[PDB]
Design a protein around this ligand. Sequence first.
Ligand SMILES: *[C@@H]1O[C@H](CO[C@@H]2O[C@@H](C)[C@@H](O)[C@@H](O)[C@@H]2O)[C@@H](O[C@@H]2O[C@H](CO)[C@@H](O[C@@H]3O[C@H](CO[C@H]4O[C@H](CO)[C@@H](O)[C@H](O)[C@@H]4O)[C@@H](O)[C@H](O[C@H]4O[C@H](CO)[C@@H](O)[C@H](O)[C@@H]4O)[C@@H]3O)[C@H](O)[C@H]2NC(C)=O)[C@H](O[C@@H]2O[C@@H](C)[C@@H](O)[C@@H](O)[C@@H]2O)[C@H]1NC(C)=O
Ligand SMILES: *[C@@H]1O[C@H](CO)[C@@H](O[C@@H]2O[C@H](CO)[C@@H](O)[C@H](O)[C@H]2NC(C)=O)[C@H](O)[C@H]1NC(C)=O
Ligand SMILES: *[C@@H]1O[C@H](CO)[C@@H](O[C@@H]2O[C@H](CO)[C@@H](O)[C@H](O)[C@H]2NC(C)=O)[C@H](O)[C@H]1NC(C)=O
Ligand SMILES: *[C@@H]1O[C@H](CO)[C@@H](O)[C@H](O)[C@H]1NC(C)=O
Lengths: 324, 171
Amino acid sequence: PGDTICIGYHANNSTDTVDTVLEKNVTVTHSVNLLEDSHNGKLCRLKGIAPLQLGKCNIAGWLLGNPECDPLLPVRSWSYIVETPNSENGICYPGDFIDYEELREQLSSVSSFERFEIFPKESSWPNHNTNGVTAACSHEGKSSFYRNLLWLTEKEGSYPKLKNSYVNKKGKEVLVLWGIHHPPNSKEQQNLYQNENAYVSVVTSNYNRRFTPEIAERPKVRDQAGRMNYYWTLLKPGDTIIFEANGNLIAPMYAFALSRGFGSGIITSNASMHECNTKCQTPLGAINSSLPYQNIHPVTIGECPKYVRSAKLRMVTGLRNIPS
Amino acid sequence: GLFGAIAGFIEGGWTGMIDGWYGYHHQNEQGSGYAADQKSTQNAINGITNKVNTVIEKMNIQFTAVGKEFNKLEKRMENLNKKVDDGFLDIWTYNAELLVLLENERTLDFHDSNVKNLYEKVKSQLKNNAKEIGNGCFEFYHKCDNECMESVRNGTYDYPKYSEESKLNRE
Ligand SMILES: *[C@@H]1O[C@H](CO[C@@H]2O[C@@H](C)[C@@H](O)[C@@H](O)[C@@H]2O)[C@@H](O[C@@H]2O[C@H](CO)[C@@H](O[C@@H]3O[C@H](CO[C@H]4O[C@H](CO)[C@@H](O)[C@H](O)[C@@H]4O)[C@@H](O)[C@H](O[C@H]4O[C@H](CO)[C@@H](O)[C@H](O)[C@@H]4O)[C@@H]3O)[C@H](O)[C@H]2NC(C)=O)[C@H](O[C@@H]2O[C@@H](C)[C@@H](O)[C@@H](O)[C@@H]2O)[C@H]1NC(C)=O
Ligand SMILES: *[C@@H]1O[C@H](CO)[C@@H](O[C@@H]2O[C@H](CO)[C@@H](O)[C@H](O)[C@H]2NC(C)=O)[C@H](O)[C@H]1NC(C)=O
Ligand SMILES: *[C@@H]1O[C@H](CO)[C@@H](O[C@@H]2O[C@H](CO)[C@@H](O)[C@H](O)[C@H]2NC(C)=O)[C@H](O)[C@H]1NC(C)=O
Ligand SMILES: *[C@@H]1O[C@H](CO)[C@@H](O)[C@H](O)[C@H]1NC(C)=O
């Protein structure tokens, strides 16, 4: 029998639920998801630049020039580096790659480099044979060798003491790799290098190492009882590297002039390259998101939401939903 | 709820009030209807926009973070790197889930307070020209046509204009 005005609040058909400290699973009229769980399932460019897909190769094989990795030779610049679960082609002549993980760490901040012939084949070794190959590094069925190194062997029965140098006028850091062969028996030693008591020395202004062959018969690996250890160093702009040997030197032929970048890295991924561009790449896929968190993957390239273990992060914006 | 209005003395919400979080239902001789209170809705929207954007701003951006490699004689360093990664992950998961739980509790209490404040605002305009009949409703002691209704909804209700008619009906 009287006019009424009532104060009240909104209800709707939302089934959004959120958690609170006093109560779980409160149904609320509006809410917002803060946890990105979506990715495109692909590898993408980062700022228009494609990643470097090593495929069946790993960093070792890429930088030594394992012949299985030949398709990587022309690639000069990348946004990130992708290894795969099948990234198996590294060293093909067995041995140790010294401070390999440090070398990978160094390549993680490289964004492009220049492959150049530090010690040209046809003009650096007039008194040595630059022709050694091995079946451990076969290409197309024929014995071969790393496209960035050069096996020096005796020429006409004598291995004269060599001493060559290079001066880094590239105005950037030069990554230099070389190798040290360890024959399995004294016969092979003398046959390849004619000086059973050989040595190699590599020196820059800040690097100083001397190498001695260790000759022994070891378990065969890729059908080789011999060994080859691999070494690297960064040559500072304007500095000089000097090699000196009377045997066993696997000499540099190609080297890399590096340019540093930011926000690069190495990741391992099942996923396939695609014609897409992204600001945020995980190994499972690319994220296109403004949300602050994500439960997709802890490994991220670019500018990504923060990884958390959470299954659900939903923030209520509206009200308790109480439809009448 | 902490302020006693939502799911309290106003037992339920209104599917019929589609255009804001809080508002009014009226009934007079000209009819009945819902109207959202634009101002209290907008103030709440400003607050919660700012709350959402605070979470966003404080998390910033995760820059490039990748795995690291250790050889077979670097196990201690490998485990230390893993302890660091797992430690940070525990902490950010904890911070994120807790921030949301605690802020969700405060967001609901905020709405509860807004509804309560709106009710007290109307009650304070109407004084004894209306009866509190519970469930958030006022029964006018006088005829309140659509213009009078609107003056309540926008905070210009003329109490003396109706006091005499109201005193008589209140007898
Ligand atoms: C809360 O309610 C919303 C609507 O309310 C109900 O809707 C129906 C089901 C009845 O029960 C009503 O009494 C009641 O009000 C729900 O959203 C609604 O979902 C349905 C899906 O079945 C959707 O219907 C589709 O509409 C599109 C677009 O057509 C226009 O329709 C209206 C009228 O003009 C317009 O306002 C809209 O904006 C659209 O422009 C139409 O293309 C669809 O057809 C396609 O799919 C059907 C099969 O479903 C197929 O046969 C067709 O041939 C064609 O392929 C379809 O008819 C309603 O439009 C929509 N309502 C609104 C306002 O958008 C809501 O459910 C949620 O709806 C979706 C948005 C989606 O997220 C669903 O997964 C959700 O369940 C509901 N919320 C919850 C939490 O339950
Ligand atoms: C990432 O997602 C957004 C939306 O989820 C896409 O939206 C585009 O954003 C640009 C700039 O804000 C707009 O100019 C376009 O109109 C939006 N697209 C559409 C279809 O509306 C954005 O393109 C996505 N990016 C990628 C690389 O997929
Ligand atoms: C608040 O409500 C009052 C009551 O309706 C408004 O005052 C009237 O507004 C209508 C406009 O449609 C006029 O026709 C009347 O003449 C007004 N009456 C008086 C005494 O001014 C008032 O304008 C409303 N204020 C706002 C901001 O909406
Ligand atoms: C790679 O892909 C397979 C499916 O083809 C999947 O089951 C597997 O888990 C993936 N590898 C990793 C390390 O996630």
